[PDB]
Subunit: 401 residues, 4 copies
């Protein structure tokens, strides 16, 4: 059954036609986000019983890579939607799922994030939740890197409790409308790459969050991650989403370069080459990177299958979660090194005119990859894999590991 | 999910690790270990159960090769090459030949040797000639180099070029013959940097008669299969993926052995402000970089191995199927080659000076083994082949190396 | 005597203030080119006897790198000026130089190129009085805007004495028939005005010609002193790449000191104490130190041979090998450093497009493609393995 | 004069003839050490007035690299002799120089080390110096990695004071005869590479050190290093010696590979080239490594000239010493990466037969380089250069930085 993947492939084809012009402007790719809404793919992981497609994580990951190969910003938005959905599904109550999931199908929800990317200790988080009557909370503060925060049907929001008789310093998460009073999407995203992901800041001014919007009790995510209960799959799932962004960009860059080489590169006739496509060093560049891409992609498919396997389990052991996170981290490390090298070095196969003509726009691939690969430092993913291999220590679960 | 065969290979590898350091110094023929492999039954992994074999798959074979190679690269090589030789026989032998040979191979515990599918020369430049005799036999003459596993071999897979042949000179003939056939001399002239117990020296054929029931196909049939990209040309991707698993196995064995050394000799650098080398950020980074690359390379290799099995089971294979497989194998080999050559050298940086000051530690065996065999055929042309496919949509030209 | 270098350092300091906004616009950095004119440094290699500074190639190369570290386009324009000057000096007669060089000092000449860079089809048709008419369109004409003179190359055509012979001339950029097309819109090197120039019936007078037709080809085939132009110019490129590398490293370090946060899971209090941040700076700073030190030695050898009356193909070939080696190392270094330093700075260095650090990669990524480093590598390999010096050309 | 370098070149040629058989056996290369004695080059830095050659550090460094290119163990021994000589010369009194230097010419001293390479805090040093009457000290203990300790005419020895009314924990350095009673060279060097450097352990049993053998007063080296006086040049001098071992090994390996390639120019059967010396990928391997070698050697010559410049100064500032040490560390880092990569990857240019015949012996270059590059961890030389560049901190003078 390749129906969903065919739909994603067709979306990506349409995105390729316009990405060069669209991403220069930045801003919100509303038309393309609506095209994704109409495709139904946002419901890939919602059961057929609840109106979704009843598909699997391997399909999601392949769709993410395909879309990202055409437009990295749309790939990012699409993949982040599923990271946000994964968080919801891992913490939501039975009655929340019975209400939200049919509604997400009917209303074609595209989920945004504000924000699960807090590069700081919990007591230093920008956004605080203070109690209101009847179990509600009030959210205040400004957070940056709110991925996909424009045109979002719901925002997955995070805050730390304050002035709370039931405990200060606890992480609360909630899924709220983006037009709730006091939510201000600031529109300040102007980035090197990932230019159409609307990953700017969001300011919360006295924003009300109701109990039926809270995703577990305050502090539950800390307990679930540290214990290795099922929600501890969120981070390997999400880090593998990022991995598929990088592999998608890598494949799109390699295929765009090859098209240029076949139609535009002149041979270095000084060295007796009649066609650039027959040049031994041009061929070596393509071979080195296509070979690494093939292996990285084949490996990523295996880890995606393991995500699905553990996703279906009722309980996951620390060894099972830790081995998965190590495999994901390994795939991310290899994909990061590959995409960053490839998107820069492929110019050496294409020649000077590929850079002399700014309009060719090939630098988009490097810009997009160079931007998002910094989400969290690959040096610490490397350290995490090393600490496991040498010392048998699995990574400490967190929002980044 | 039958893990019995892989358990047997794991136990074999365990025993080999105990003695490999002393054995590989001596070189020569690891007869005791070859006999342990014979007793294990694993040489029959790919023979059908109907013919007395284990009826297992290429994924199992490849995993077993990597496991054994991680303990002893020469024994992994010998074991892997046995299946390369077996694959050639299976792809070219008649059903009648197989009906006789495979039960015999099970009963007599055959360990196959090679003499030799590694020529590195145009057919006209081959040293070993096959002169036709009136009954359809061929007389073989010449000295063949790089005859891997040629010592203690129950049968040799032999290649020669026709000479003085009214039906055409320069055609490749292949046969499977006893190693004690009159005129066969295994020369034992192997004294190498690494892969020191693979007996990859020369074999001299002096008037060796190979009989018609030992010939594999007709003269030149392997060249025709290569030109067609047909199923018998699967021999090369199968064999190149065997090599890939030797390199992944050596890499895994090296990384684990290094980790063991680091944990038990964890003296930190004075100025480094570390209490333990196992907490040093730069030691951890070396292990992490190489372990990550190893995980991805291994996971990728498993996928290519499943595809080998799929096409192995087909009655017919198209050049497009064969070419895509060869590109995928070449890609895996390229990554595995770069990985094992970098890792076996750079892990010293994580272990520290005493790992090299003590020759007896013997860790350089991993680099020596990998550095030797990765030269079998130049990785630069595997890279060119993948690039020519990706850029120009040209599949590699089938050959004994591509 | 560091007076010239001090002038270059102060110019570079001024250029840093404005480069971020200027290079976005592209186009011609007229004000900064005029600052270079006022500095006198365009006359670095002209003898004091002819009104110049009487300085050495080592000083020129250090000034190029310094300016390039601040503004790669201005570094390129400045460096190319000296490539153009080197060509004039190697081929012009003493009588021509006695006129041109004091004029270049008085009129503050900034030389442009059209063009030093396979098969050339801009033609030079001989006229009876020794003049030529130039026709055709050149590409990649670096510094062709606001140029006091253009160094122009063409091949003879309709020539009873032999078609296809290369002629070179130094002509005013506003001579009738010269059209600078203004079509440069590039990834990096955005203010180098390296677009196309169209020649329509452009007259070249005999006293503007540099040597005789085909003389440059003869000099390449002989490996004689004028063939030094290529190693001189390839080492100019090398110093652009080393300068960009140093500028990028320093800009990154400033960001790391003033803006980088420690990764929350690092267990370190300051990003400047993070072991992996320190390893990135150390690995690239170390390579830069060795590359810069080696480049200084090769620059001294350029000067030594520049002063010789005659140069052998063995002297020229050995120098070219050393220049190629430096260029290879500098190319790899600058391309890796300008991309990887983001990993020492963090996500916010890319999240804020206005920071503009990608300029370094864009500039280096653009100009390092001038000629393929793969063939510089092959040339060094062919020398080391087969004892064959590079075949002299406009690229080797 | 190029006399000394001609002498070194001729020595190196002789060593190449026998290095394969000698390094396999290990042990002491006595005949070759005596050849170095006959050459006079051990006296390169002794003034002509004291009987030496009156030469300079740039000459010494070139000679080290030339000899190392032929035989890394002899290059190491020769280089370490000059590290030992530098230490002596930086601390010896006028009386000691007047006595020792003519004696070193006449007796042809080849200096050994036992040992300036203590990977441990001063208080934790293996070897102690306890006061004796009349200003003598008694040395007791075992130190490992005593480079060139066999057939050494004098040993440079280091110990820490104890039971010393004038201060415990102070570093004493002395130059003593190797046949002084109580000195036991243990002969336990059996290494991967550098196999003929006799870098095993030395045991001191009640060894007497007289006042006229002491190199300064106890603790003077620590004062000199901390102050940046002239003896603080010892570490950059010595680390640049190691750098020249690595560049020498690199050049020797590259030249040996090229000779093999030229005399075994068998092209790969399917390469489509007539000869391996015309293969594009063979040429790329030689070009990449030859290019890096040219730049590293040129940079090393510049740093050697700076060593000589500061060597002649009466005073060196902490900035001058720190800048030199940064330049030396940078050279050592680059040379380490280059030699380790080159000595392994050049097999790819030569082909399978270069490894199939162990007797070819090319692996000696990798084994020698792989062994000595671990002397002190390159990761911390990298950190030191990074700490300088990013934080403007020069390395703290020590025996390793
Ligand atoms: C680094 C770069 C871009 C990004 N968009 C959302 C997160 C994030 C992190
Ligand atoms: C080619 C290259 C290296 C080798 N080691 C054992 C066999 C063999 C063949
Ligand atoms: C001028 C400026 C940039 C360039 N890139 C390649 C050539 C070239 C010339
Ligand atoms: C002398 C010889 C070889 C060595 N390896 C590490 C240190 C050291 C010292």
């Amino acid at each position: 059954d390749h129906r969903a993947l065919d739909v994603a492939t067709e979306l990506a084809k349409t995105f390729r036609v316009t990405v060069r012009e669209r991403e220069r402007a930045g801003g919100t790719p509303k038309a393309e986000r609506d095209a994704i809404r109409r495709s139904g793919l946002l419901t890939l992981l919602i059961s057929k019983e609840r109106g979704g497609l009843g598909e699997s994580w391997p399909t999601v990951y392949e769709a993410i890579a395909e879309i990202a190969s055409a437009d990295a910003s749309l790939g990012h938005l699409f993949g982040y939607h599923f990271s946000n959905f994964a968080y919801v599904d891992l913490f939501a109550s039975p009655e929340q799922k019975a209400r939200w999931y049919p509604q997400a199908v009917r209303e074609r929800w595209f989920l945004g994030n504000a924000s699960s990317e807090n590069n700081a200790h919990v007591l230093d988080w920008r956004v605080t939740a203070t109690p209101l009557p009847d179990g509600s909370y009030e959210i205040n503060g400004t957070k940056a890197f709110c991925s996909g925060s424009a045109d979002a049907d719901r925002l997955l929001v995070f805050a730390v409790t304050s002035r709370d008789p039931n405990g200060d310093g606890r992480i609360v998460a909630a899924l709220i409308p983006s037009d709730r009073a006091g939510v201000q999407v600031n529109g300040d995203w102007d980035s090197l790459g990932m230019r159409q992901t609307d990953s700017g800041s969001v300011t919360f001014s006295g924003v009300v969050v109701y109990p039926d919007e809270l995703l577990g009790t305050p502090g539950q995510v800390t307990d679930a991650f540290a214990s290795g209960s099922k929600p501890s799959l969120w981070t390997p799932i999400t880090q593998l989403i990022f991995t598929h962004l990088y592999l998608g960009i890598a494949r799109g860059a390699l295929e765009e370069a090859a098209h240029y080489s076949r139609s535009h590169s002149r041979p270095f006739t000084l060295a007796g080459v009649e066609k650039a496509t027959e040049d031994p060093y041009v061929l070596a560049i393509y071979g080195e990177f296509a070979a690494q891409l093939q292996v990285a992609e084949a490996g990523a498919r295996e880890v995606a299958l393991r995500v699905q396997e553990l996703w279906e389990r009722n309980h996951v052991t620390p060894e099972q979660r830790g081995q998965l996170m190590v495999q994901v981290a390994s795939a991310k490390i290899v994909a990061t090194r590959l995409v960053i090298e490839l998107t820069s070095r492929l110019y050496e196969a294409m020649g000077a005119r590929a850079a002399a003509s700014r309009q060719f726009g090939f630098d988009r691939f490097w810009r997009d990859a160079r931007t998002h690969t910094l989400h969290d430092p690959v040096a610490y993913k490397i350290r995490e894999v090393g600490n496991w291999f040498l010392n048998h220590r699995f990574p400490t679960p967190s929002f980044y590991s």
